[PDB]
Design a protein around this ligand. Sequence first.
Ligand code: HEM
Length: 394
Amino acid sequence: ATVLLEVPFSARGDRIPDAVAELRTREPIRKVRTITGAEAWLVSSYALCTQVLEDRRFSMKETAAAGAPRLNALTVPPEVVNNMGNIADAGLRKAVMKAITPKAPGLEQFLRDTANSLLDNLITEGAPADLRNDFADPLATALHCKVLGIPQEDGPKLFRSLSIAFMSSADPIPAAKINWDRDIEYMAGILENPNITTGLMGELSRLRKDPAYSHVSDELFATIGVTFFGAGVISTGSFLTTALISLIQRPQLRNLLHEKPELIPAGVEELLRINLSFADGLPRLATADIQVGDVLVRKGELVLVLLEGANFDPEHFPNPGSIELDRPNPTSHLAFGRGQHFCPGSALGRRHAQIGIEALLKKMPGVDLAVPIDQLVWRTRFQRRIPERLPVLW
Ligand code: HEM
């Protein structure tokens, strides 16, 4: 006798398990058990993944309902699971999205200068260099401090909440609440700080005193700062780190992008497609009885949308494990989700990775792992797949 198949399959972000293609071929919607002990439907084909993500009756908000089957424990207050919905209901969606575009004046040059400075420091210290802790994550932290309008010196402390905030735990995490409440108090102080006049927190600080938003709670204003810092920094930092591994493991692509840097955007789109940075399927709770493939999902059941199920589906992306720079459908991957909850920072995330890779290939054209790839230590029970350190030489 065997127990029900458990998720996640592997914390390794450098290879996709063979199980994924087996599930996709044989039962693209399949029952599994999550780390909390709950049962869930794991969806692993492009067609069914997109169906679930495009049907709002599969609700993100309702995953926070008391007594629901859970992928993992909440690390935020339950209302914050509806964060973007709360922002939209507050009339703040356009302002938030405008503040996080990479097209802001001097934002791309700041990104380039910051990446170049980080890399110069690594070259001065000499190999080996840790491309996660001393490049990708500081670059992500600096970018989001600039985008939020908060002092660069405040970034490191805010960043150090994230190894706990984005845990994927069977049980509530006391440290998550300590850090959450402290980070909220910080952002509430930012809103009352007269020096904070640029970026997202500068714009929120002004809207807060605007009569058209007098009804919006101070709770939400602070929450936007904490959540956009946290989600943006952990997602861009983790993607860039694991994208650098994918690139280092493909020296022919690395040499090509070094020689023809105009291909970097198409390369990053492929690196997004094959990226394993999301450690769990995207969770949704059915609010009605809904047919998904051969399964009638019942109201109240948990559904998990496995992004690498969709992104490695050969019926949508032929030769899916291969990086092809001339695909007919290159942005049709689900690395940023799909539908109601499509990532609002997708443009910023792309530019972070493009500029990071562009600077790295210019400064370190011969970059390569300094340890055998199996020696990378993959973080467990976390919402992202990342190596704890990424040691390279050049
Ligand atoms: C390469 C970098 C990034 C990746 C791979 C990524 C991935 C994703 C994915 C897959 C979702 C959908 C989650 C779901 O449907 O359950 C999402 C949503 C979201 N992302 Fe991103 N993201 C990135 C960058 C960012 C940045 C830079 C920000 C903000 C500064 C951000 C903030 C958010 C927010 C607030 C949501 C929730 C949207 C909603 O519920 O409507 N992300 N992201």
